[model samples]
Target: MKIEEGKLVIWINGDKGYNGLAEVGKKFEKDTGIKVTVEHPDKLEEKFPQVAATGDGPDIIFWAHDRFGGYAQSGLLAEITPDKAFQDKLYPFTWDAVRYNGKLIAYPIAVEALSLIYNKDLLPNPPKTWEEIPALDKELKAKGKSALMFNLQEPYFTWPLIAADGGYAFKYENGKYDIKDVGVDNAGAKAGLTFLVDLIKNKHMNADTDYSIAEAAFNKGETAMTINGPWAWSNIDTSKVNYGVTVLPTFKGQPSKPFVGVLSAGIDAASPNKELAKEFLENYLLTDEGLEAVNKDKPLGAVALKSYEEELAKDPRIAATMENAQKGEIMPNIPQMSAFWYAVRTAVINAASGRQTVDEALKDAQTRITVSPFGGLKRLPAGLLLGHGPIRMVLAILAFLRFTAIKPSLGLINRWGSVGKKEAMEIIKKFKKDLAAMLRIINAR
Candidate 1:
């Protein structure tokens, strides 16, 4: 509905995390003569596509970088060519998050990575490694409390072990993914997943738990630690919980690497104001003042610049996040990674929730990731059969016979149509007897 040509409509989520965009929009409008309007669409992901399909949407859209690949490939994102200064400011992996097929897809805003947020009242120390967690949990259960919890049904927080043990979603080769080299069923993946199965079966944590349950448990002093990121800042009232943060525990020499997401902004490809969008992002929003304004509205996360990163580290949680971000994997922005979330997450849940064995869950995920759900579908073949697939060929044969003056002989519709079931059975009986008599006569002759 915001169709003004002179205006730049910025669409971000309505939550307090991004409400700053509206406040910043006012400043933008004041600084430049351009009309700036910031909107909080209820369903940014689903609704953006709908708006984009109509060849119009916001001038700039702020969202997680994981969606960049699908959006960029679908022609919804405009490629921004970063200058040397802009490119130099960010970490290498931050670029990878926003890049699609070697093209820059968005302006990197801040780094969001998973880390342990623990209630200081319970455990005096955050776990140094994932292995030490169960022992730590024992101390809590004596008091009828959970040692640690997270969104177990979700993989984003749980996938650290999967990556820690040398498992990966895909093989990264030469700055891009080899789509053929999916690793959800790799030996290391089995190790990682089996470890998860071991944990859940052992009752160190609840399998069916989600973010809310885990968060509430920690807030009420019933749980010591939980995994989450800055986006969850508003969920906790630290005044009551008295929480501290730390990175995930290591296994031997391998780091428990969480997936690092960079919340970013990208110009809409179909927008008439692409140039203006880029100018605003590069000029206005990239400034220190602008980032501060963002932090004022919500958890700004660890911004790419050194000063901002340092500023965020002042909060111990952001410090934990910064450490994790360095050790974490930049989530793949390639379209090949599109299927990994549901496919792998389900595998983890199936195993973790006891719905299936570890191997079964891993294999199920691999089948969907590599072969895909449609792979088992019947492929078109040259044959006459039932269903739409076979009808294409059947219709072709029919059309060919009819067109060449060589139509296939049918059962002379009027005669065959009138045949009763009783008459048909009787005819078959007589025909069989006559065929036997003919065969006997032929043999005797």
Candidate 2:
């Protein structure tokens, strides 16, 4: 296959991912003379599905592979089997992650896992096991301090501790995931849950806290440590306080295993440019140029065959965190796993809040799943039928004009309009630039 010069449209989520995509696109265009335009949606969950339904999604999309399972199963993702040379270049685990039902659906960009981040000024060395945390908390409490901070009410936030104790939300068996093998009800999980409850009950941790509060607490040095991932590194006040990272503590020789979340780029099955999309993946996203561009700003662990561990090890803070990430467990991509998430989260919330006994909470969560509607009827919003009125009509018309007509008219308005010249010109220039770029490539042969 010859590498032909063409325009490519790539859609990605907000934050560092969008920045990385834009950077790579510019570099790719500069190097290969193949133009690329990137679109970053504010809310990808809502936008991607809507676009896919209309067969108008971008040729390439960056998202969590686990979240793509249902879309892939529904025939939204293009299956691309990279050549052996390209396949062999990726890390074994990353290569395995993109495979579903004997098809390669995506290419991995970054691998993320959780770690324990602490204020090193308070404690030079963080606790290495779950058992040591309580005593440390007590010692800190004696000195009017907090040893740790966490969001006890959120189950997803607390999963690392539970998993570290050798508890799983669901088990994969016989080529399918079985939620009946709920690990949250096991002894190890219960111990982890008990530890969390004790923190709240003993006033060592607040039950009403959220992630934002936890971050603030850590920044203010109100807490000695917290368990989080690389995403939090950007938000921390590193200059104000010394901090260290380490793997989450374990119990009975079982290392605490953090859940690994991956972000990847996949081609849209409905796209007419599947081959071009695959080429983009091979020559850009999986290449050294693409990986370096992504890692430069995001500073994440790459899933490519090349190890970033030695590079990360140079910095003690990142090194400590990478230790846990290297051994982290990848989340299973199963549609039924959604049920387990709700069930486990409900049980954990109930137990943590003291609203129900642990066993009762688990039973209630299980019962809800067993009786609730399985994949049968698709429910549309009740507002769809009831909210169609003059107000909705007016709003819909205004939205259409704003997005379609007015947005594209900025250049003309700025070029000729007499009022609000500066603001109008700026708006027109920006909109025209973006619209022209999108249209030029979107209409290209």
Candidate 3:
């Protein structure tokens, strides 16, 4: 069947928002005569909700798989199950991510995995396990150099260290998450936390150092090694540097597990041309043209099963990186994943900075729930309405009244009541008439 021609509007995030999507759009238009417009919102998180609420978002969205679950639950995502034939042809993990409640809500575009990249000129041989890292760090420090470089501020970068020590934020038991079994409290997790603290305390690393500092240190040959992903390969200055990629050092058979992120496309459920959009994605995004755009612009692995190994072999650095990535775990695509980030960040920071013990930090992190506020009261404040001391109770009551009654009542009155306000009176009258009509019908019955 000839694909129907239509304008496909896309809302994208990240560097792809700036460059990749534009190039892809032109290619799609030229090849298929399909018009495509890519837009990056001034504030994506804010704009996405507003657009989705109106049922008038872009034809496609380039978003992280983590946010798909919430959007699908809210009816903001399009159910693309009818196009499974095309989806099945794509990467299995990517296709599975879009399935929310048995409905396909997205298409795969690009996949990225993190690995350890070290300066071969400086270290010669990298550590294979966590136990050997401290000795390397001590040796490097004695030589007035850093053994490793990392952005300690980012949880994404630090979580691998925790994972390497066999710690996890959540435990999946029998195909379901059991928060009570938080791996952060595990002995391996404590060891990881202790390792970080020792690194900072011994001047082996600094918690205050950011990515730019880490990158500069690595590029200047001040550090022996660093942990980073494929995206950094293109940006690194390789003029006088020889770097080697390897899997993160393990602890007792537990390897450092970095989160794998997949860049993907999903059709808007509200789009009038859903079928056309799906066809356009399959033709442009799943083809060599789409893969080329990713390699040329992003220089990462493709999500297509057919493309993954071949693309890695074509690039030596990618090949080495893929060896490490093969041991990495896929990130959960559930929408509630965002809630875990803040807690993880805080715990890692606290433990690394020596502000809190590993056990305390882990306990705090585990208390956090990964449920949306709208999903229910997952994060209710403690204490009874009147038992938290009289002053506190009185203040709470006043605050509640202001929000739940007084403020809303006044706002509604101004917008729909008889306060000598023309608009308010008109709205109130219309609402009352509708209410009266409904009551009348009930009474007549």
Candidate 4:
């Protein structure tokens, strides 16, 4: 037996999806006489590379699929190619999330993306077209409510509206992202921004809303709809709000495409427990029994394992999210995505705040993105490296910094290299002032 008797360690973000995984882990231990421990460590993204490089970290890392590029590039992840039978057991599209630069680097566990989360009590039926949204706005306002609310600053939530007309962060071709082809200022982008501006102009929506405000408002039954994902349910389900989820309807006759994210797990290349980890992953975690356990506490929205088809049919929320995942574009896993976030957020804020015209804001965003210092660098800059990590690790850190800071910053973007404290503080302060002014306007009205 090549299996290690000691233990197999896994690192995940938090306790949200742990019970199911830990339950599966317990079965793995019993089946093979090996111990399994799943840990939700603090500052995992920053600390993982340091410990992993020295061959002293968890055997497996469970995180979003976008992190695959950085880990694979840094020589931290091992490749795992499932046979045809194994492949058939999961959804075909989910495989794309684990494949980076042509190699399969991880296993996709769950799929998620933005959806039309609405208050069923307030709006019994969701709109099937963007043209219907404004009409619903009027109806809701008559009842002293709003039609839709979301973190307006984040492109991840807004991309559907933008993409309905051809807006995108980068042009994806031949199975790779063309980082040079930034589309924030394209004609379609301007059209999308115009639509959002029109909504605010009509008083159908608030330009100042972020996730916290939107979430609180929805829980208190103030807003009829929000653009959010399954991860939001832990709070929404707790509220007395009778909520329903569905894929976003068409925008001006065009389909709205959100960015899809996959929850994935990868084995550590430097771990001595690779064989045992693989056994636990392939033989146990990927099986129907394991997936059922994982899906028990939380519907892993759009589970990659096909055996959950019955569950999907039973839960309209999961089915709708899966449909959205199929309709949306997979979020680009490249390191250059760091620049996209900053540039896009700046454009959204500028246009939404009336500080700049839609055209001007998008053009400015395009300029800022194209001038990115991290684009297509053959040699890694010393400044990008953290301690003795490799060039791959450099990009990995940049990729995760924005995601890790996503919620706390309220979608305020972060740039990895050469963003000084003074400049960062100035940006943060201005963002606060912008949101504060808009909030005051809402109160006055």
Candidate 5:
């Protein structure tokens, strides 16, 4: 059922994620007789909605899973209701990602999970358990070197250790993420943090360790192993360091699971070429040959398909990456996930900086996350505090931007549009995205 005269428009996030699979566009164009136009946007996330609002946007776009719920709720994403053949190509858990309101929302392309990237020139073999770390540290220190390093302070990198003992962020059940339930601060998180403090006290690691130090140490051959994702491999100086990778070792007999991310495709609900987009994703892209082309362009991550495993696993990096990914947990891509990060990040820095004991820190984090005891009237809109006016909050935000003279901060709130109905909620969603983007810029600076 090839569409004879249809053309397809798609937008991909620029750089390696796009470049890695740039070749696939040609294959798609050739096989389907649909002329494909793919643009690498300077900032797809920022620009997409602006263009999409004009009713002139790509038929398909590449992105991650977490925001699907918000978009689907707003009627921005198209639920294709993928057939059995389409479902058969992917892993069961991956379905957790593509579904919003129990309807398939995206076509999953690849799954990424972090692993222990070790410098083979140093210890030569990585340990399989936490118990063996001290032995390796002892062996390495004798040669004027240290062992095992990672970004201990950064919450994203440290999630694996917490999960090793059964910690999680949200309660995922029945193919849905429960935002009301916050699960990151638990016994498993406490135990994992406790283990980490012991490591710091014992001299195997230090509280000061961050991603910069961890990366530099491994790249310069000062440490045997460090944990990272596939993206790290491309930047390593291969001539100076011979390296290999493996799944993170066990901690007290539990696997340290990393949050897995899937890069995927979703149809634009407003696109005129929905059928063409569906045809390409369901028929051509799902095929073994099509997936291979996707991977061939950029071994970005592993394809979520059983039939394609042997093919993708042929690359040693893919093999090792997928080994960890198999045990991976998907990070909930809901709006509240940002709140979870703010909570965990504070707790992580508190304990890692030795400002508080593991118990005190984790307890504080969970307590604050579940019920913000410190904030005003339990994290409510200032409208209630100021006697019913959203303008109070928006004005304060505008006032801060005026003082800072940072143009980007102005984008954080929607200065346009009247309140109520469709116009009101859309502004709220825009506020969230722009606020997140502003934070990213602020953090970077």
Candidate 6:
């Protein structure tokens, strides 16, 4: 019923698709006469949560599905269930990305995953399996080039190497993830870690390569291949590196499983236009025509609509990225997932750098995951006492006593009228001395 105002506002960060989304807003305005404004706010991911706390924010917020758990749990997002017919139009897996605690929370816009992107000028044919990587590396090294390079510290970029077999961050069953059951140290994970460590130890891949180093080398065509997603294509296109993208090659007999990321937009819990917002999303944003316009500019890996699959596949980048997405696992959207990234990244660094054995590194990672549940200090009694408790108690006691050192306020003692004013003043001075000593003791702690 914010329709009375006839304006719909949404906020999104830096993404080329938003330009096309702005175009769709024009058509929406023409049909419904409701002015639609798309805002490109800087640092929206950090700003939205803070703004939402004040019960004020945009009608809709565009962000990745990985933030769904935090937003939903914080009561910053409204639950939205598109009808079955509308839900059935998109790929089923994409729906999982937008759901939290068995309820739909957002509308899936597009899907993305890590893929093997090779410079066609340097590598005419990408390998079909990881077995070929070592040989290819040797060949490329002889010519003063690298076969493959990616951000060594980024767990997201290297997840496929450690999870291609049976490794997983958490156990998923019946559509719910058991955060308590971490599998990073399982037998399959050890095998995966072994492969990654050997590649670094043998110098087949750079031990010090991070995102910047990998991106610079790839853009300059100094590396034959890299593990990246569609977002990296714009910069790669600028470099004119004749590159082609494909799903990651198999390891042993199992295909690599990269973490799938879904971009989505959700209605704000504080919005006054919930119904109108849903109408806009269902009739305009989630429609094939709307997404087609979006893809026209960015060529995203969209699994939003089943019928649009063939059209998106016409572009090789979209086709490869979407194929990898379909084969990949939906990243756990729980807040506990934060620990997995930190642990895995640390483990990779330790093992790859030879600071620790692969087994020890993985064991340390498992310990980190298991210990994350107890990491919050706010839940403990000592935490409460140390955090603002003593200061507040001191203020409350001073107010109750009503004894000021500079000038005495005998308000309470006068109310009783049992003692002379002079006697009350003497008692107040002694009480003040004791209170000062107590405050000093509290402050020392």
TM-scores vs. true structure, each candidate: 0.77, 0.73, 0.75, 0.74, 0.69, 0.75
Candidate 6 has which clashing residue pairs, if any? Answer: none
lDDT of 6 by residue, 1-445 (tens): 1222457788876654677788888898899888888887876866776665233457788877887777777667778878898988888988888888887888887787889999999999999888789999999999999999998887887779788878889999986788889999998888888888889888888668997899899999999999987767877888999999998988777888898878788877656667888888888877779887776655567557777775667788887887887778878778677678889989988988899998999999999998998876464234322223343333333345444443223542233344456754666675565555345323322
lDDT of 1 by residue, 1-89 (tens): 45456788887765435666666667878888887888777768667765662334677888778877877766677778878887876
Model 3: runs farther than 4 Å from truth?
Answer: 1-18, 31-59, 82-85, 141-144, 179-181, 237-240, 272-276, 305-311, 314-316, 370-445
How would the candidate models be sorted by lDDT, starting from the highest? 6, 4, 1, 5, 2, 3
Model 2 root mean square deviation, Cα atoms: 10.4
Candidate 5 residue-wise lDDT, 262-343, digit = tens: 7778776656577788888777766687776655554556777767866667778888887887787876766555456678
Candidate 3: residue 229 lDDT (0-100): 70
The list of candidate 4 runs beyond 4 A from truth reads: 1-5, 13-16, 30-52, 55-58, 83-85, 131-135, 198-203, 354-357, 373-445
Predicted structure 4: lDDT: 0.76
What would you estimate as the lDDT of candidate 2? Answer: 0.67
Task: Give the best candidate by TM-score.
Answer: 1
Error of 3 at 40 (Å): 5.7
- Tell me the whole-model lDDT of each prediction, alpha carbons only: 0.74, 0.67, 0.66, 0.76, 0.71, 0.77
> Which ten-residue region of model 4 has the weakest summed lDDT?
407-416
In the range 219-250, model 2's lDDT, one tens digit per residue, is 88888998776656765744477777777787
lDDT tens digits, residue span 282-389, model 3: 776676666666566656554554554465566766665656666665566655566677777888888878889878987787666433334554632453332233
User: What is the lDDT, from 0 to 100, of the residue 255 in candidate 6?
Assistant: 85
Backbone clash tally (model 2): 1
lDDT score for residue 366 of model 3: 63
lDDT of 1 at 173: 74
Clashes of 4: 0
Give candidate 2 regions above 4 Å deviation: 1-17, 31-47, 53-58, 141-144, 152-154, 173-176, 237-240, 305-322, 325-328, 368-375, 378-445
Q: Which ten residues in a row have the lowest lDDT in candidate 6?
A: 380-389
Using alpha carbons, what is the TM-score of model 1? 0.77
**What TM-score, to 2 decimals, does candidate 4 have?**
0.74
Return the TM-score for candidate 3, rounded to 2 decimals: 0.75
Enumerate residue pairs that collide in model 1. 129-249
Best by lDDT: 6
